[PDB]
Amino acid sequence: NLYFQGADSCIQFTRHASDVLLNLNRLRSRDILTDVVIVVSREQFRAHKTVLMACSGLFYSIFTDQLKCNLSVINLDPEINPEGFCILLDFMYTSRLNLREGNIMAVMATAMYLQMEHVVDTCRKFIKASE
Amino acid sequence: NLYFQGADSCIQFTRHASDVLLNLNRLRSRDILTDVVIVVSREQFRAHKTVLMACSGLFYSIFTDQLKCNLSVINLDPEINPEGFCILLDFMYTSRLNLREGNIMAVMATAMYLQMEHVVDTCRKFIKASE
Numbered sequence: 613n614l615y616f617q618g619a620d621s622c623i624q625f626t627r628h629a630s631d632v633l634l635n636l637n638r639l640r641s642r643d644i645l646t647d648v649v650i651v652v653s654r655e656q657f658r659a660h661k662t663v664l665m666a667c668s669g670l671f672y673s674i675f676t677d678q679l680k681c682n683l684s685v686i687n688l689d690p691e692i693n694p695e696g697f698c699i700l701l702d703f704m705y706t707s708r709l710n711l712r713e714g715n716i717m718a719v720m721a722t723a724m725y726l727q728m729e730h731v732v733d734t735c736r737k738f739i740k741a742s743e
Numbered sequence: 744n745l746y747f748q749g750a751d752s753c754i755q756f757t758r759h760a761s762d763v764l765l766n767l768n769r770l771r772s773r774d775i776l777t778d779v780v781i782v783v784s785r786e787q788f789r790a791h792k793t794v795l796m797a798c799s800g801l802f803y804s805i806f807t808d809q810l811k812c813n814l815s816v817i818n819l820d821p822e823i824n825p826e827g828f829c830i831l832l833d834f835m836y837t838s839r840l841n842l843r844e845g846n847i848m849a850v851m852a853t854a855m856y857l858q859m860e861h862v863v864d865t866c867r868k869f870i871k872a873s874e
């Protein structure tokens with residue numbers, strides 16, 4: 613079944629949020645309605661500002677600023693690892709975090725900078741299990 | 744717990760898609776980064792084009808059209824009921840469909856026009872149960 617009676621006595625669709633996210637990622641792959649390019653060192657990543665703000669405390673602060681909300685290019689701190697950013701941008705659009713021994717430190721540092729706390733907490737838990 | 748091992752051996756976050764949708768609806772309530780106004784008769788509804796395209800075959804067609812993708816105002820067919828549109832716009836941003844005996848016919852006609860098939864199918868199932 614695709615729906616259920618929610619706690620508030622309203623009909624709720626089980627797969628709706630994941631289907632919207634799937635379609636937003638499809639728009640990203642096809643470069644449709646993307647309104648910003650995130651520059652990390654020499655790498656560029658096209659995205660939708662609303663998705664970035666919905667997933668990151670840093671992007672939420674930047675795109676609510678009256679002056680920065682209109683910028684089409686956003687440059688991140690040059691210390692940010694582009695692969696770590698790519699993994700997190702993929703996570704924002706998919707709910708899947710490709711965490712590996714070789715990338716976990718850069719993904720954790722990038723999530724700290726981007727203010728994605730649950731991702732930071734998860735990284736710490738996986739690091740603690742290795743020690 | 745907030746995560747699990749997905750079928751593809753990747754870490755997946757259970758609440759991520761619903762949390763992104765919750766934040767997109769918060770942006771809509773605060774009128775932040777909304778880039779279109781949908782006009783239905785005398786009523787106006789501000790929204791994010793990406794969310795509309797992700798939820799409707801009609802909006803997906805309109806906003807992928809090279810000429811219409813740039814429009815800041817979109818006028819719907821004057822026969823469309825504004826309450827039916829409002830209920831569906833709320834559903835797009837929340838996963839909850841406020842279906843009632845008094846609105847089900849207008850919600851079904853609006854979902855047919857907007858090309859939201861599962862909503863149409865659900866409306867038909869609820870109508871069939873009343874007859």
Ligand SMILES: C[C@H]1CCOc2c(c3cc(Nc4ccnc(Cl)c4C#N)ccc3n(C)c2=O)N1
Nearest residue numbers: 665666667668669672727728729762766769770
């Ligand atoms: C889905 C989740 C994934 C990553 O974890 C986090 C967020 C996360 C998101 C926001 N963004 C809003 C927070 C509150 N209200 C609004 Cl309208 C918006 C937006 N847009 C701010 C701060 C956030 N923080 C600290 C996170 O740790 N997003």
Ligand SMILES: C[C@H]1CCOc2c(c3cc(Nc4ccnc(Cl)c4C#N)ccc3n(C)c2=O)N1
Nearest residue numbers: 631635638639796797798799800803858859860
């Ligand atoms: C979440 C769900 C809610 C309502 O049910 C429907 C959609 C629905 C969505 C689209 N939109 C895309 C369909 C395929 N690919 C992309 Cl990139 C995009 C976008 N954006 C097209 C057609 C759609 N149809 C016929 C529906 O019945 N959305």
